Design a protein around this ligand. Structure first.
Ligand SMILES: [Fe+3]
Ligand SMILES: [Fe+3]
Ligand SMILES: [Fe+3]
Ligand SMILES: [Fe+3]
Ligand SMILES: [Fe+3]
Ligand SMILES: [Fe+3]
Ligand SMILES: [Fe+3]
Ligand SMILES: [Fe+3]
Lengths: 178, 178, 178, 178
């Protein structure tokens, strides 16, 4: 039995380019987490308590996704390499602009997973393509959810009254089309 | 065993300037109470039933704070001196202006506690600094809450529709960022 | 009513040096979080599942502490500034060496809070000294806990059998002297 | 409606090389089952009751996997061909050597599934690639589990005391990192 780079017994070697891609994706998830924390703060600063609660939860969820990927590398007997984390964006001129950044962040997270998936396919690392598939499935739902929240905020057309109504929806947990 | 100014057994003498400062602070809490009663009435007169209920409760809470301080003086064997209470402010041109006065009242209550705290520190009255600390902690949360209510009302920008929505939030007990 | 740097109504201005100190401390808590994640991974890589679970939980707790501080800045109407986060230490030659780093990390977190506390005292920012006191109290218990875990691991003197026994204690939630 | 090789109505024909690959994989699962039975016996002969119970359960699970594949061939209207089963390995010089064989057996089971998956992909048999994906996902977890058990036994470094502790973990159902 061979030992993998992290010292554990190795079921199947992993291409170093694929390993680096997964390590970079962990950074993307961690960056999404701190971005949603920054968005939660921006919303709290403007008394948008429902949006604050929503993004506070999204920050914790993205971190959980990051840890899920670190656990996969452990399972593959590959080394983890936790990287320096950039500071998030922290300033927006409107809730609509913040929600656009949030949607882009969610789409960019999927694009990063898809890039890892394509590289796994090129290397015939079927454990990795199989591992990623339900995460891509979850990303479709998150993209649908963020398109819903962004579209509903844009529908409000900057009316504070409409934004208060939506804020109360989010506080109540009404965060998707259902 | 020595007897304190209120006749009870005295654990530790208190500087008369610190005693006067605590007696004055009791008046501040009582004045905050009647101010919030006046605000409750102003809101009821304009059918803002959620704001009326909120301030009715704040009035009772501020009175409870006042009594809490009278109990501390009893515990320190110091005399209480319940003072003449000024009439509250009763007229505002808008809910936003009323909420600004409410926030200032809450901040001024903290500033009064802090002044008592500093005087206790100068006199090394550690019983008093310790007694006041959790009250200052509670004031941070109240200041956060009143900044939230004021900021949400200002966000409404005088739209009656938005103010009705916020009024219903307060009636439901949704009074903080959470 | 004045507006604070983050745009909310301002109860009491804050010295910019104290604000920077709190922002830096948020970074310390975030760095403790990612350090404990790195330690959790190191333990998982060596099948020390109880230590892995323990540090996984500590990572989430430190992040919660960081968010608690961001909420205080919001409450004080001060700006948050989420910073670039250094990569954690990731390599240790023994569990005993890892636990020494963990204890030092916990002690250094307290030292950072104490430095903020002293600066608040110099500026007479009593809201901040009061806010920090229960966090310092919690740090005493965490330091006691980490001294216990480090000391118990050192008692094992590198015996894998003893380390397996302690690992099972941690998996069971037996993480303190009690 | 056409009839498949096993006589049932045929939804989609299957390449004979892919059919043979699935039949061979059923043999791999059956061989893993009898290998884990042999390991269960080896452990029972040395009073390692927790390891005996663990491998007794793994033997039954591998057999269930084999039956799951026979059911897929039935569903595809393909013939099953239950093959002669080799005798398992039965002798090891140490628990650590047995656990190495167990890990290799688990990894080899995944490699066999991956080979079937690749052949299905080459033939565009999407029913089969989809059917196999959750089985590959389960194999990642089993490989992680067996790397954990092997690594924990190797950490014991042949100390009977440490092996008794781990044996009791397995009897209690503590068989993964968690
Ligand atoms: Fe994510
Ligand atoms: Fe996301
Ligand atoms: Fe009060
Ligand atoms: Fe008050
Ligand atoms: Fe902390
Ligand atoms: Fe800590
Ligand atoms: Fe199997
Ligand atoms: Fe298996």
């Amino acid at each position: 039995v061979a030992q993998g780079p992290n010292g554990r017994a190795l079921a199947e070697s992993m291409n170093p380019d694929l390993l680096s891609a997964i390590q970079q994706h962990i950074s993307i998830e961690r960056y999404a987490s701190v971005t949603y924390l920054a968005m939660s703060i921006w919303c709290a600063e403007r008394e948008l308590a429902g949006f604050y609660q929503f993004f506070d939860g999204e920050a914790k969820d993205e971190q959980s996704h990051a840890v899920h990927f670190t656990q996969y590398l452990i399972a593959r007997s590959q080394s983890n390499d936790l990287q320096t984390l950039d500071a998030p964006r922290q300033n927006w001129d409107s809730l609509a602009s913040l929600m656009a950044t949030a949607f882009q962040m969610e789409a960019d997270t999927t694009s990063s997973i898809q890039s890892v998936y394509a590289l796994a396919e090129r290397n015939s690392d079927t454990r990795t393509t199989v591992f990623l598939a339900p995460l891509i499935e979850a990303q479709i739902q998150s993209e649908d959810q963020f398109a819903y929240l962004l579209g509903r905020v844009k529908f409000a057309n900057g009316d504070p009254t409409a934004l208060l109504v939506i804020d109360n929806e989010l506080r109540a947990g009404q965060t998707q089309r259902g």
